Amino acid sequence: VYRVLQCQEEELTQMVSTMSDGWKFEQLVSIGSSYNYGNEDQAEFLCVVSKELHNTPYGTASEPSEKAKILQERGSR
Amino acid sequence: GSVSKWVRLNVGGTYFLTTRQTLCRDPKSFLYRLCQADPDLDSDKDETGAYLIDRDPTYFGPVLNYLRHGKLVINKDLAEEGVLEEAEFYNITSLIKLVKDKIRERDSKTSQVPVKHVYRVLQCQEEELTQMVSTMSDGWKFEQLVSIGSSYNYGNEDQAEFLCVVSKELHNTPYGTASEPSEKAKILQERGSR
Amino acid sequence: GSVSKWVRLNVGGTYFLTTRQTLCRDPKSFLYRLCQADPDLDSDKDETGAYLIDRDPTYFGPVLNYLRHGKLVINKDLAEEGVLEEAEFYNITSLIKLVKDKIRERDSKTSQVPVKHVYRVLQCQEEELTQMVSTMSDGWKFEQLVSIGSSYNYGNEDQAEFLCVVSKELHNTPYGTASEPSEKAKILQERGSR
Amino acid sequence: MASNNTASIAQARKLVEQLKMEANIDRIKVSKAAADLMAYCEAHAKEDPLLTPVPASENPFRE
Amino acid sequence: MASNNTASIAQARKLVEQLKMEANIDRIKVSKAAADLMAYCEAHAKEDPLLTPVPASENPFRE
Amino acid sequence: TMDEKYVNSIWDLLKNAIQEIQRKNNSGLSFEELYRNAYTMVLHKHGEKLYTGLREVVTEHLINKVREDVLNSLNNNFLQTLNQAWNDHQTAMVMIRDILMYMDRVYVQQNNVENVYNLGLIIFRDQVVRYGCIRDHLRQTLLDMIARERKGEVVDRGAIRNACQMLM
Amino acid sequence: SELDQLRQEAEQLKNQIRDARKACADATLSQITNNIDPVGRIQMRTRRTLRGHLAKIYAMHWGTDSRLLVSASQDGKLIIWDSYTTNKVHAIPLRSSWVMTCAYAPSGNYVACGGLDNICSIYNLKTREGNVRVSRELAGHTGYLSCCRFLDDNQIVTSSGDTTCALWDIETGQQTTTFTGHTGDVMSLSLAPDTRLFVSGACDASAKLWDVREGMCRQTFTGHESDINAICFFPNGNAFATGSDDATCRLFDLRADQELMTYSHDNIICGITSVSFSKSGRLLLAGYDDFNCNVWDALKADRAGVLAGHDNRVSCLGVTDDGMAVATGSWDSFLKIWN
Amino acid sequence: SELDQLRQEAEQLKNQIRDARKACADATLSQITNNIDPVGRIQMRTRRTLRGHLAKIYAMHWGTDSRLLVSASQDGKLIIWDSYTTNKVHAIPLRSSWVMTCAYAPSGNYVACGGLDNICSIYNLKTREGNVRVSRELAGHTGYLSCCRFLDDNQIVTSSGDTTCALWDIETGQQTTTFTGHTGDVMSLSLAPDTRLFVSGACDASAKLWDVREGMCRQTFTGHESDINAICFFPNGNAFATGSDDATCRLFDLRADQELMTYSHDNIICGITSVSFSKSGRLLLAGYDDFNCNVWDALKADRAGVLAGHDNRVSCLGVTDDGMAVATGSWDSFLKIWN
């Protein structure tokens, strides 16, 4: 499973150091921003992180409710 | 001899004591020809009478395992190819089919020693990046996100701000067999080439 | 050898009761001469009336398997090298060549364990990029993609815009070599260095 | 059967059978089908937005 | 005899053999062969775009 | 080394062995050796050549057998000789089929040709029931028995059944 | 043997079909009824350019709600677009390479992608977690699958190579309803809005309408002599436009069992690579494989309009389920929306 | 012992050959006819600066449609350039390091590459999947490959080290017919367009023209005193141009069995490393260790022009196989298409 932690350059040390247990860092990239060449604005980096899970098909024990489907399709569009 | 409650098949010169009904599993097997009585054999031990059959005894282990116990589980020190080749000799189509399935399963689950992998690139704008990264397919491994610059809207929030690049430990080349080339596939391939 | 078509050998103390036909598959075989009478042959055991081949039967198995049914499968616990060395003692050239190919295939897959990886660099513009990423040579791996800014065809869409490193593991599949004494190769190496 | 040039008879048999009900099925005049198509098209011309200049507000493609 | 520079008889024999048929191959004089070549080249001069510059819409390197 | 040389050597031995086996005997070579040989040839793909040989083999066998018993059938007791010889030909075809299933299951189907057992029956059909004089003599013998049956006396019903069975 | 008698019987039956068609072949009122005003000059504007592909876009297919289209680009990637905001809802990495067909489920919860791998991949758009997981790897196709459309959420046909179109039970994963009888690699596959008859276009240039329950060729339309590329049913299910390598698009009709109308230009040599009908079906959008597409009047065969602006061939067309915009999956790696 | 005969016979045989060759020697009318059909000045411009390579390009081989240009660099990469668009149809990484030869099959389905591995890699340029899977890594070379050429897409002749230029069956990987007789390494290899003779240039400065079916050397042409760089067979299958480290290129004619003409200029002492015939064969494009190449009028023995615009040696030349323009694969990591 993969996640994209958006992090500003100042904050960067926190989430890297406070990296969760069982998770593994996989990639870090820079990114521009609206102010002053990209840094110091509120954001400079995306840290892609990954965890690993025992393989078992999803939805073989749970069937989504109707409100869940409504919310998912609201979020998608 | 031709019929006995138990028969000592000298496979590789080694005795396998097997009972008739297990050999009676499939009519087109060699073992069926041994069970039935129509003398065309002269090959056996010249001091006991046990039928000497010039075949490997080692892989007859798994062959007889499948024969007498229904399902096949091979010994993980015997290469499955020998099991298939020895099954060819005793002509059991079901076990051959299942061994081919097992070979394909083994190669799919493990063919990364010759590092067989599939790679794809998936350009994504910075905004929906977290969505398709998080919801990225099960079984595929993310490999590298690469920024792509632009001169659009002060260089940021362009429709192409990133190139995700993912991989897959599976491969579409044969696990033992796959989709084989054909003339019309080549026609469509060169049509798409131009 | 003029009696007992199912001729009994004492290979490594093991009584191999094998037909003349299998051994006579490849007359280039030491044993093919034992299928027939010859006066120099005076190697025998008088405790079982079976002739002596003072070679181990542990690797004689796969050799006899190949020679009987034109193909061998070595166990995943038995040395391919031992089968090979037992192979030349009977002088079957094709079997030895095939086992050499198998041995070098295995050793290529274990030269991976030493830190030995072949690296290559390809260059790509943004459009064509994924096309090589997708249809890249099977058995390699993607390792790195770096965007290098351009002023010739500024930025994006320049051929020199993207550099894609790829790699596989060092192999010696048909064979490996450390030097070629041919002089002209050395001359060309010196020329192409600078 | 394989002695009649290796089972080539079955395909022709199937062709004859499949031509039977194709001969049987109802036949309609070309003019009738044409007029039906015009009727449906003209009845739905208004509700086909391609045929009508789409105002700047109603579509999610000028939204 | 393989102690005669490791059986040089075979290599010398094939050298002589190869030297044999060179004479039996046709000998057609230089002037006539050159005439043949110029006839071919001048006849094909109009179909060599290097000697016959061609429009931009019929060559793939300006199209 | 010449693989094909070894192949045509063992295939010559197989030609003689198959001729003996179809001619019938139980003193002959072991079925296991012939089975092993045939399966290895089909797997290694010499069998295609073997097929061109084996089909040819079938033809010559009929020619070297069928014509002969035809001469015996016309001389005396036509149906009885035809029945015993058909029994021998059937057992020969069955055991040559049993020697090698590998060719029938894949190669015969891949060629889009029919079973070698079916092909042997077809050659027998050409030799016996499509050949003019043998067909006429079979029809005349059947006509004699069915006419005598029409008269009312009991006839050799089993022979008539055998003939009708070979017809289907 | 019996080949000659059955050949003669098939010949006379086919001649009977021909005679029935020509006898019931009246003058097509369409070109005659040009007193009805033409469609005039209507030209759509590219409201959205879905530039999110690098590889060439082969198949595009609007969703059941006509907001979430699915496109397949040849490298092997599926992009479910949101056409109202130009944001990718998903971007699926496919094991398949050379994908030519992507189909959206009736529920809008599955996507069927087909490549040369001979595997119809059925990807779940939404799993219980929320990622995109493959529902089923439908394997067992003799050749490559060229096109496919869902009959159900456990039923789908696959117009594949080697003359087959078998309906597959997705739940079990084995082919269920065979549809053999074609003589070419069945490339096209068009479902009528009734979904009880599907017309398949192959390289034999014969459009075979198959009944999807019994499974025999209900009708056998002919009149093309070049491989049929795309087939688009009329919004009613009574007629369909058929394209091929010829520049002639043939509007066939089921009632008359024969072509009603032609859309051909002797000034265009490009093969009709995609056919689509608008909401009313009055417009026949002629996708041309040069770099751009046209649109005819499906009742007059005159120039309704031309949608150009792609620098490489439009390989597939799609129309919204309200017909309110047309997307052009082209080979310039763009999906352009024309309102 | 008996060698005393064999040498003297050989000694007189060559003598006879000389007597024959000097008998066959007449005035070359080409240099005499330098008034007929003057080529004048030739000025060409590079229109494709294919710069995908980043290391010295060693060999090319234009496709049999003059569109797919396979060019190898010694780093271990092949580029199948799309010469009409300056795009890379394939960038192929090679396990072998320091490749020097790339042979393009007559079908555009296989490619051949030989490096300092003694291995002739044969790559299937297209499979069912689309990825470039290696077909066969031909083993059996006793020396390093220098050049290879396809005869069929399953038969291939190579030029290898240690006096070996054998002909291989691709399927088995076995050299069917081992040709022997050279006294040195075999660098060059040119095929006749008759597909019946291959001329091997070895380090002994002698071009041995060989039959292709069985072991038999058709001729032993010798005009050079230096090892042969490249050989270009005439499009008539009757003569070939030959370059070497000497500033002299030489034209050897089969019918005359001797050097028809010489090509040397005091202006250029650099060895002609690459030779190539025009579509007509009138012109001869010569690449040079000098940092630009030139063109002779091959039937005037004069410099028809100069192609300049490089800064490192042009180690290989390629000409479209209908004749349109010239690719100049230099060691500057660029390929230039002079049209």
Side-chain angles (χ1 to χ4, degrees), chain C residues 120 192, chain H residues 55-58 72-77 96-100:
Chain C
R120 295 296 184 251
Chain H
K56 322 180 168 300
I57 306 117
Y58 266 28
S73 47
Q74 81 290 34
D75 48 63
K77 87 180 124 165
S96 298
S97 316
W98 279 72
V99 59
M100 39 291 292

Side-chain angles (χ1 to χ4, degrees), chain H residues 152-179:
Chain H
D152 168 282
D153 309 326
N154 197 55
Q155 298 306 136
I156 182 153
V157 64
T158 69
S159 40
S160 45
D162 160 13
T163 71
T164 298
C165 61
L167 165 56
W168 266 255
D169 168 23
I170 287 182
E171 185 65 278
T172 58
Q174 290 317 93
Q175 48 299 320
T176 89
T177 48
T178 294
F179 298 82

Side-chain angles (χ1 to χ4, degrees), chain H residues 296-313:
Chain H
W296 309 69
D297 187 332
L299 297 184
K300 294 197 191 299
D302 60 359
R303 180 177 297 181
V306 47
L307 303 175
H310 313 263
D311 57 350
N312 200 3
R313 80 162 59 185

Side-chain angles (χ1 to χ4, degrees), chain F residues 55-69:
Chain F
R55 281 184 291 190
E56 193 279 316
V57 164
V58 178
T59 37
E60 56 206 356
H61 216 98
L62 274 92
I63 298 314
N64 67 24
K65 179 164 297 194
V66 178
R67 193 53 41 205
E68 295 56 17
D69 42 354

Side-chain angles (χ1 to χ4, degrees), chain F residues 130-159:
Chain F
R130 299 281 77 195
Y131 166 114
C133 185
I134 297 158
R135 186 209 306 188
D136 187 306
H137 200 287
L138 171 54
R139 177 191 288 108
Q140 290 282 357
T141 47
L142 288 180
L143 183 50
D144 181 22
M145 330 165 189
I146 62 186
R148 287 182 296 179
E149 160 187 5
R150 205 55 79 257
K151 299 318 169 278
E153 89 205 52
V154 182
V155 297
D156 38 18
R157 290 149 185 162

